[PDB]
Amino acid sequence: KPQIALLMKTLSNEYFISMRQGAEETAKQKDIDLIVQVAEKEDSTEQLVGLVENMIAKKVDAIIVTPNDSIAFIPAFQKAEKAGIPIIDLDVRLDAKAAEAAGLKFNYVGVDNFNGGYLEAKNLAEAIGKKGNVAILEGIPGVDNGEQRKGGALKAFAEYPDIKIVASQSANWETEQALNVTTNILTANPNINGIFAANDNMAIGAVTAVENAGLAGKVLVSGYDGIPLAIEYVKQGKMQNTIDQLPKKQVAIAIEHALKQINKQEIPSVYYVDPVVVDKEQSKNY
């Protein structure tokens, strides 16, 4: 009965709670013994590497890890290759050029976050009337997934000359911070009518601001991940859209990909699940 480790940067997020649950359903279905270990602060890279190497030391059958740093985990991954343990890079993608440099072959599973943001910004751009002033809420500075979604958004508003990015501030993926930041951003420009948030938590924090500010219906918010509560807000109209990243399908493919590599079959180096744009008429399905 093969023993697989899932090593996660956090569980404080609802999104990962969702992925962990889907992970355990796939584990049960495929008769896998599944070992979940979570890092303590979301941003502590060292401790997570700590965790990966432990699993190497325990000679676990496979490891699925959601990295904490695109580069820090490379020596970890090429230690796992030397211990002949297959290993799947989930969610956050390791630096390709850096991986190239060190002779490392590694396998990712996720989504195009650039595309996801492009698709997500584009929908809100259209929603606020191809016109207005937008403000971007970003994740923890540096993380690829966050910046990718930003670059994605930026490309999209660049297509609407009557939409101008007037505010961009990091809310670090936390609801409570995005409420603070959004409030301070809404006072700063009263001509803001649309809010792009790079995850579902900051979108929720951003909606609470506009409704606090008596601005419901007058500023439209987009999010990213597709968590239940975001989806509900989309139903009620409190949100314009979120992008369902399919976190269960992702980690399902991760576990499916580990198993193949345990049985010495080839997997793609990259696998991008196809995200869904979730707005009120696609909301009918959620």
* Binding positions for ligand ALL, rule: CB under 6 A: 13, 15, 91-92, 145, 173, 199, 224-225
Nearer to ligand ALL, 193 or 241 (CB): 241
CB of 116 to ligand ALL, least distance (A): 9
CB of 41 to ligand ALL, least distance (A): 12
CB of 32 to ligand ALL, least distance (A): 23
CB of 173 to ligand ALL, least distance (A): 4
Nearer to ligand ALL, 32 or 93 (CB): 93
CB of 174 to ligand ALL, least distance (A): 9
Nearer to ligand ALL, 10 or 123 (CB): 10
Sequence-distant (6+) residues with CB within 8 A of 280 are 234, 235, 237
Nearer to ligand ALL, 199 or 241 (CB): 199
CB of 199 to ligand ALL, least distance (A): 4
Whether residue 130 contacts residue 160, with contact meaning beta carbons closer than 8 Å, is answered with yes
Nearer to ligand ALL, 132 or 247 (CB): 247
Nearer to ligand ALL, 86 or 223 (CB): 223
> Which residue in 42, 48, 96, 90 sits closest to 73, CA to CA?
48
